[PDB]
Amino acid sequence: MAVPPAYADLGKSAKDIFNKGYGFGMVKLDVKTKSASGVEFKTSGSSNTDTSKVVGSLETKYKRSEYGLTFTEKWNTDNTLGTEINIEDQIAKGLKLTFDTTFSPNTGKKSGKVKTAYKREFVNLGCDVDFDFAGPTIHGAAVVGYEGWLAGYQMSFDTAKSKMTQNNFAVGYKTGDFQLHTNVNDGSEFGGSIYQKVSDKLETAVNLAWTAGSNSTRFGIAAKYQLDKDASISAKVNNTSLVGVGYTQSLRPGIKLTLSALVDGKSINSGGHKLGLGLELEA
């Protein structure tokens, strides 16, 4: 089953080291409940410490594995309504067809897209069509993989402006507990990442970024240490001397609390320091 990850998921494990475990400047509550009928609910809510912009949301998910059907309804505090229809492994295998819609009964605006995915051995393909105010826009991504090596191309195109708006390449290589990933976005932005699971308890990642049109280089070191099986500690630092720390505790299987802090170097009296609270409830 050498079925590659989709282009968007290349370098995921390293990104997850750098990004989850943290939640600076926000307080977050995510609740996944389940009714007797089998339809499940997700209610998210987040608040910025500065803007005081509270966002709320409810999602309702209904499944029918027999037809490969997922039906999702979405509500948020912007009064925006969403509806998603997934049809997997029916028109063919393994082909996934998706219809996504959004509508806002205040501003009248209405948007939609048709997503398509095709998973197989050595090949993971995708083609989306976004219908909006300046539509349509065609997205296409392709990833081939054989024996650890990975090769991907991502592309987007405004049909109206007759203009290519995305042109990205990716080369990857995994040897199990070690991932290497590189990308070239628009012939301008160059990126690289390295994931390494050194021990049972220690995970480690490294970020690199550079662009022509400058001698500008940004890079980062990240790590995640699994104290016991119910507690975890993340830490990271970049070349701007921003130090991130995070600590996540599963109080009970299903309930995760997360504390995070961002500390600027060097500072005491004058620095942009941030805190973060995150709570995940799974019932």
Q: Which residues are at the interface with ligand LDA (CB under 6 A)?
A: 52, 54, 245, 261, 263, 273-275
For residues 7 and 143, is the Cβ–Cβ distance under 8 A?
Answer: yes
Rounded to the nearest whole angstrom, what is the least distance from the CB of residue 81 to a second copy in the complex?
20
Rounded to the nearest whole angstrom, what is the least distance from the CB of residue 50 to a second copy in the complex?
8
**What residues are paired with 83 via a beta bridge?**
73, 101
Region binding a second copy by CB under 8 A among candidate stretches 120-128, 200-208, 248-256, 264-272: 248-256
Rounded to the nearest whole angstrom, what is the least distance from the CB of residue 270 to ligand LDA in the complex?
12
Q: For residue 161, which phi and psi values (nearest 5 degrees)?
A: -75, -5
By beta carbon distance, the residue nearest ligand LDA is: 273
**3-state SS, residue 145:** strand
Is beta strand 231-238 parallel, antiparallel or unpaired with respect to 69-76? unpaired
For residues 100 and 113, is the Cβ–Cβ distance under 8 A?
Answer: yes
Amino acid symbol at 73 = E
Residue 29's binding partner among a second copy, ligand LDA, none (Cβ under 5 to 8 angstroms by kind) is: a second copy
Amino acid symbol at 159 = T
Q: Give whichever of 49 and 165 is closer to a second copy, judged by the CB atom.
A: 49
- Which one, of 217, 199, 216, lies nearest residue 208 by Cα? 217
Distance separating the N- and C-terminal Cα atoms of the chain: 32
When asked if residue 29 is in the footprint of a second copy (CB under 8 A), the reply is: yes
When asked if residue 251 is in the footprint of a second copy (CB under 8 A), the reply is: yes
Find the binding residues for a second copy in span 33-62 (CB under 8 A). 47, 49-50, 52, 54
When asked if residue 245 is in the footprint of a second copy (CB under 8 A), the reply is: no
**3-state SS, residue 20:** coil
When asked if residue 229 is in the footprint of a second copy (CB under 8 A), the reply is: no
Tell me the DSSP string of 32-48.
EEE-TTS-EEEEEEEEE
Q: Give whichever of 184 and 261 is closer to ligand LDA, judged by the CB atom.
A: 261
Q: Give whichever of 26 and 206 is closer to ligand LDA, judged by the CB atom.
A: 26
Pick the binder of a second copy from 27, 58, 184, 209 (CB under 8 A): 27
- Which one, of 209, 214, 217, 169, lies nearest residue 192 by Cα? 209
Question: What counts of helices (H) and strands (E) characterise the chain?
Answer: 1, 19
> How many binding residues for a second copy (CB under 8 A)?
16
Q: Give whichever of 188 and 240 is closer to ligand LDA, judged by the CB atom.
A: 240
Residue 138's binding partner among a second copy, ligand LDA, none (Cβ under 5 to 8 angstroms by kind) is: none
For residues 97 and 84, is the Cβ–Cβ distance under 8 A?
Answer: no
When asked if residue 279 is in the footprint of a second copy (CB under 8 A), the reply is: yes
Residue 209's binding partner among a second copy, ligand LDA, none (Cβ under 5 to 8 angstroms by kind) is: none
For residues 57 and 77, is the Cβ–Cβ distance under 8 A?
Answer: yes
Rounded to the nearest whole angstrom, what is the least distance from the CB of residue 279 to a second copy in the complex?
7
The residues binding a second copy (CB under 8 A) are: 27, 29, 47, 49-50, 52, 54, 251-252, 255, 257, 259, 275, 277, 279, 281
